[PDB]
Structure formats: structure tokens, C-alpha cells
């Protein structure tokens, strides 16, 4: 399985660690999708910024 | 009126009033109660006013229970001074009361006798109140 993560809500105004979380996922721009492996370390960051993101389980 | 006879410290920080009561939340002594619906610092002057009112209705008879006590010292800076030059002076004492506490309970009296003094008492208070009577729930705590 992999994770398809989409940045749908802007990080402007959220704590820096949440902004950092987007950076560990390699997310820079809104509406941008990145496909990442589903390991716990990746998923922890995904769940941190879940209020900023839309996630789908794929392949 | 009510005030501590002595205390370890003269002046107390103000703190907060968040949440429902920690306890005092069930009838424990008398037949009926007056319970606080919203948070406040109730002053000794009000407690005594409320108390006196209740004994004033009963005339001869009844027993009044005061379940709150003003141990928090109240501070005010002297009139017309500017900010600074230390903490104000203690000018009065308050009972920190949260939603759900019984403040007053009555005993040895008809139900209409109690509804009415507790009502009259209630007007003397800076908060909204609900009158309650002893239930098995109170019995069971």
C-alpha cells in the first residue's frame, strides 16, 4: 500500500511544526498530491496535518 | 459576618472560575437547598444578607445551614491611585462558588416556608439559583 496525500488547506497561520510536517512530506503547494509509502513515520506526519490534507489509500 | 479567624497568607491571587463545582453538589443536612446556577465570588455581605433574610421569614423556628464560606481575601487599590506600588489592600472576603453547589440548606419547616425563604434568599445573591429538595440521589452520595 501507498499513501496519496493532497494538500487542500493552507498552512498559513498554523504552528511551525505543522508547517515542518508538510515539508517532511515534501508538500509545498496547495492541491498538490504526493504518493508516499505507508510506514508509521510517514503516517504520523500525515495525521499531524490531517486537518490540512485529504488522504487516500492506494495500490 | 463570616471571615477566617487567621490565615497563613494575607493576600491571594485571583485565579479562575472555570468548570462546575468540585463538591458541595448534593443536599447533605437539611430538607431543601439553594444551588448556584452560575459562577461567582459571593461576598460575606451577601451571605449574611441572605442568611438574615431567611431567619427573618422563619421568625421563630427552623435551622439554617451555610455550606459556603468566604476564605478568599478580596483586594482593592485605594481610590484614585495609579497602577503599581504593590498589591492592593484586603477589603473583604469572598466565597468562590461554581455551578452546582448547595450554598444554603433549610430544616424543620413546612415546604412552602422553605420555598419562600430560599427564594427571598436567592434575590440577595449576585447569581441565578435553583431550589432543590433532598432526593434519594442526595441520600446515595
Amino acid at each position: 500500500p501507498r499513501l496519496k496525500v493532497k494538500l487542500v488547506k493552507s498552512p498559513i497561520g498554523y504552528p511551525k511544526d505543522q508547517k515542518a510536517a508538510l515539508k517532511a512530506l515534501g508538500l509545498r503547494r496547495l492541491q498538490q498530491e504526493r504518493v508516499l509509502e505507508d510506514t508509521p513515520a510517514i503516517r504520523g506526519n500525515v495525521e499531524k496535518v490531517a486537518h490540512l490534507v485529504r488522504v487516500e489509500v492506494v495500490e | 459576618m463570616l471571615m477566617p479567624r487567621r490565615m497563613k497568607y494575607r493576600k491571594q491571587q485571583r485565579g479562575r472560575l472555570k468548570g462546575a463545582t468540585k463538591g458541595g453538589d448534593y443536599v447533605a443536612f437539611g430538607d431543601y437547598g439553594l444551588v448556584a446556577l452560575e459562577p461567582a465570588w459571593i461576598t460575606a455581605q451577601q451571605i449574611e444578607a441572605a442568611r438574615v433574610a431567611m431567619v427573618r421569614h422563619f421568625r421563630r423556628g427552623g435551622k439554617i445551614f451555610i455550606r459556603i464560606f468566604p476564605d478568599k481575601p478580596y483586594t482593592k487599590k485605594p481610590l484614585e491611585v495609579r497602577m503599581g506600588k504593590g498589591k492592593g489592600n484586603v477589603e473583604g472576603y469572598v466565597a468562590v462558588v461554581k455551578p452546582g453547589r448547595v450554598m444554603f440548606e433549610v430544616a424543620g419547616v413546612t415546604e412552602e416556608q422553605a420555598m419562600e425563604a430560599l427564594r427571598i434568599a436567592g434575590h440577595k445573591l449576585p447569581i441565578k439559583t435553583k431550589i432543590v429538595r433532598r432526593d434519594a440521589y442526595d441520600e446515595a452520595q
Binding site: - | 448534593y26 431567619v55 422563619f58
Partner: protein
């Protein structure tokens, strides 16, 4: 006399969900069992006001059983003053400790002079067999003056029931009433400013 009350078994349903759907979360326990239950709050209330923790409630479980229990503990919502959780203690042939009413028979002489019968304990804790539940225990308060009092020692016990507290415990008292005539002294009684308990070369 005796009360019945339908109970139901609960699993992962949230207490939050249950109470909003009108039901009251609870638990069932004794030495051998422990089960999550829920009861109808409205039906329960009807029973409990009569029942209290004094009389055996029996729980018609939907699996067909019928269990004999005492309400042991009740948790109230402190803000709203509404029950939120019930402990049902399922009785068995072995003796059990419980609270049994006191009915202060008589009108005290302390009361007839103007006094007030301060009912300290309106029940008393007691070890006794389930088969031996009294309806109450009578008390002769007619002899009480201001301020004369009865104890747990003065408690005359029904057959087969043993006292579970120290007989030193006071149970009822007759005390002076409030009087508007005391106001004159009480308003004219002088109160002093408060004395600070010391720090430093003072303690």
C-alpha cells in the same frame, strides 16, 4: 416492598450516545461477574426514588435471567444534577453491608419547646443476609430535648442484623431554632480583621 427494572447489555456504544438516546449507562458486578449494562433513565428514576439504596431492585436481563441487586453507587452530573452512571451490585446468599432506613417515631420534647430534630443519619450501615432485609429500623425520639441525642448504640436491631459502624456515631439531635431575637446580638456582635500566620523570624 420489591421493585423490578428492565436492564440491557451494552458493548461499545458510547455513554454519550446512550444518554442522549434517553438511556442510562451502568455496570453490573459482584465477586464472579462484571457486565456493562444500560437501563432506561426515565423508568429507572421512577423506581429509584422509591427504591434508593435501601430496597432490592431486580434486573430483568433480556437474555432471560433475573438478578437481585442493590444500587450501590450513583454518579451525578455536578453541573446539571442528573444521574449519569449506576452501579448495580448483584446480591448472593452471603451476607452483605448496606444502608437501612431510620424512622424516628415520636415527636421530641425538644421539638415541642421550639426545637428542630436534626436528622443526622436517615439510614444506618449494616451487615445482614439478603434474606433478612428490614423495611426500616424504628427509633424512639420522643424523649429528646434541646439538645439531647440518640446514637448508633441506642439503635434497637431487628432479628439477624448486625451493626456495621461504631456505636459512638451520633444519629439524630434536637437543636435550637433560628430566632429573629438573636439578630440584635448577631448584628451587634463585633468581628475583627484577620491575623496573618507568619513567615521568617516569625512562624
Amino acid at each position: 416492598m420489591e421493585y423490578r427494572l428492565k436492564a440491557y447489555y451494552r458493548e461499545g456504544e458510547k455513554p454519550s450516545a446512550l444518554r442522549r438516546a434517553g438511556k442510562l449507562p451502568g455496570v453490573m458486578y459482584n465477586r464472579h461477574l462484571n457486565r456493562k449494562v444500560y437501563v432506561d433513565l426515565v423508568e429507572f428514576d421512577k423506581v429509584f426514588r422509591q427504591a434508593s439504596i435501601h430496597h432490592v431492585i431486580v434486573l430483568e436481563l433480556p437474555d432471560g435471567q433475573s438478578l437481585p441487586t442493590l444500587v450501590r453507587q450513583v454518579n451525578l452530573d455536578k453541573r446539571r444534577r442528573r444521574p449519569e452512571h449506576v452501579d448495580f451490585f448483584v446480591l448472593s446468599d452471603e451476607p452483605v453491608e448496606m444502608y437501612v432506613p431510620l424512622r424516628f417515631v415520636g415527636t421530641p420534647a425538644g421539638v415541642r419547646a421550639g426545637g428542630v430534630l436534626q436528622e443526622i443519619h436517615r439510614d444506618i450501615l449494616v451487615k445482614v443476609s439478603p434474606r433478612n432485609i428490614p423495611e426500616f429500623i424504628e427509633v424512639d425520639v420522643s424523649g429528646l430535648e434541646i439538645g439531647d441525642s440518640l446514637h448508633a448504640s441506642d439503635l434497637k436491631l431487628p432479628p439477624g442484623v448486625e451493626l456495621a459502624v461504631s456505636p459512638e456515631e451520633t444519629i439524630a439531635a434536637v437543636v435550637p431554632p433560628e430566632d429573629v431575637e438573636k439578630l440584635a446580638e448577631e448584628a451587634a456582635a463585633e468581628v475583627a480583621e484577620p491575623e496573618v500566620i507568619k513567615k521568617g523570624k516569625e512562624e
